Design a protein around this ligand. Structure first.
Ligand SMILES: NC(=O)c1ccc[n+]([C@@H]2O[C@H](COP(=O)([O-])OP(=O)(O)OC[C@H]3O[C@@H](n4cnc5c(N)ncnc54)[C@H](OP(=O)(O)O)[C@@H]3O)[C@@H](O)[C@H]2O)c1
Ligand SMILES: [Cl-]
Length: 275
C-alpha cells in the first residue's frame, strides 16, 4: 500500500489506449486500464503485455453509475483512493448517420457530458494530494462556443457558473433539439461540440471547487484537446497518431509535484488556450 495509482476511462482503444501505454512508461506506480467491454479491455491489456508493460484492468461503463460505483469501491479497497484520473471515454455520431439529430444530441450528451460528470462525482472524492485529473474535451468545443449566441457565450465563459447551471444548459440543448428550436435558442449545430463545451466547462467548475474545498492538497485539474487523431472516431485521414494524441493528456497527468498550474485550463499542444 502507499503505491500510487493512475486510471484511464475508454482505455481499450484509440487515444485512451495510448494514454495507458505512456502512463505505464512514465507514471511511478500502478496504471489501471478500464473498458466498458471486458474482452476488449483484456485484449488491450494483453497488447500492452506483449510490449513489456503491466497495466491492471477494471471494468467501467461511464454510462452506468453502479459500474462507476463498483470501480470507486475497488479503488478505496486497493489503494485508499486515486492519484491520477483521465476522463478519456466518449462518442460522436458521424454526420451522415440518419439517426434523428435530437437522438444524437441526447445520446452523445448522456455519455460525453453526463457519464463524465458521474465519474467525477464518484471519483474526485478519492483523488489524493498531489493528484491530477484530465478531462479530454475537444477543440470543437471552441468552435461550438463561438457559434453560440453571445448570451450563451457569456454563460459558458463565466467565472462563476455552477455545476447545476451547466447541467441545465446541457439539458436545455438536448430539449431544444427535440422541440426543433435549437438554432433559434442560440445553439450551434454540432451535438458533439456542445457536449465538449459540457466537458470543458465542468473542468473549470471542478477546478474552482478543488481550490475552494481542497486548497493545499496541490491537486491540478484541466480539460484538453488531443488534436485530430487517427482512431475509430475520426478516420485514417486524421493528422496525429493515437500516440501523438495521448501527449497533452499525459503531460497534464504527470505535472510535477507542487506545480502551481495549469489548473482549470483548456490545454492544446501543452499550452493554455483562451476560453
Ligand atoms: N480526433 C479525435 O480522435 C479526437 C479529437 C478530439 C477529442 N477526442 C476525444 O478523445 C477521447 C477518446 O476518443 P478516441 O478518438 O480515442 O475514439 P475511439 O477510438 O472511439 O475510443 C473511444 C473510447 O471511449 C470508450 N467509450 C465510449 N463510450 C463509453 C462508455 N459508455 N463507457 C466507457 N467507455 C466508453 C470506447 O470503448 P468502446 O471500444 O467499447 O467503444 C473507447 O475505448 C474522446 O473523448 C474523444 O471525444 C478525439
Ligand atoms: Cl482536439
Amino acid at each position: 500500500s502507499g503505491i500510487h495509482v493512475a486510471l484511464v476511462t475508454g482505455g481499450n482503444k484509440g487515444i485512451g489506449l495510448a494514454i495507458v501505454r505512456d502512463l505505464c512508461r512514465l507514471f511511478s506506480g500502478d496504471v489501471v486500464l478500464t473498458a466498458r467491454d471486458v474482452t476488449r479491455g483484456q485484449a488491450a491489456v494483453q497488447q500492452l503485455q506483449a510490449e513489456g508493460l503491466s497495466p491492471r484492468f477494471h471494468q467501467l461503463d461511464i454510462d452506468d453509475l453502479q459500474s462507476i460505483r463498483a470501480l470507486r469501491d475497488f479503488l478505496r479497497k486497493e489503494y485508499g483512493g486515486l492519484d491520477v484520473l483521465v476522463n478519456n471515454a466518449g462518442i460522436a455520431f458521424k454526420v451522415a448517420d440518419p439517426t434523428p439529430f435530437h437522438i444524437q444530441a441526447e445520446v452523445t450528451m448522456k455519455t460525453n457530458f453526463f457519464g463524465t460528470r458521474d465519474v467525477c462525482t464518484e471519483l474526485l472524492p478519492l483523488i489524493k494530494p498531489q493528484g491530477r485529473v484530465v478531462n479530454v474535451s475537444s477543440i470543437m468545443s471552441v468552435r461550438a462556443l463561438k457559434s453560440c449566441s453571445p448570451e450563451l457565450q457569456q454563460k459558458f465563459r463565466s467565472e462563476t457558473i455552477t455545476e447545476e447551471e451547466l447541467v441545465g444548459l446541457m439539458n436545455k440543448f438536448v430539449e431544444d433539439t427535440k422541440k426543433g428550436v435549437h438554432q433559434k435558442e442560440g445553439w450551434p449545430s454540432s451535438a458533439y461540440g456542445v457536449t465538449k463545451i459540457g466537458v470543458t466547462v465542468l473542468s473549470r467548475i471542478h477546478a474552482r471547487k478543488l481550490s475552494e474545498q481542497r486548497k493545499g492538497d496541490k491537486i491540478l485539474l484541466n480539460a484538453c484537446c488531443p488534436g485530430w487523431v487517427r482512431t475509430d472516431m475520426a478516420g485514417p485521414k486524421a493528422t496525429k497518431s493515437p500516440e501523438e494524441g495521448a501527449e497533452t493528456p499525459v503531460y497534464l497527468a504527470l505535472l510535477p509535484p507542487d506545480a502551481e498550474g495549469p489548473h482549470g485550463q483548456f490545454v492544446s499542444e501543452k499550452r493554455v488556450e483562451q476560453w
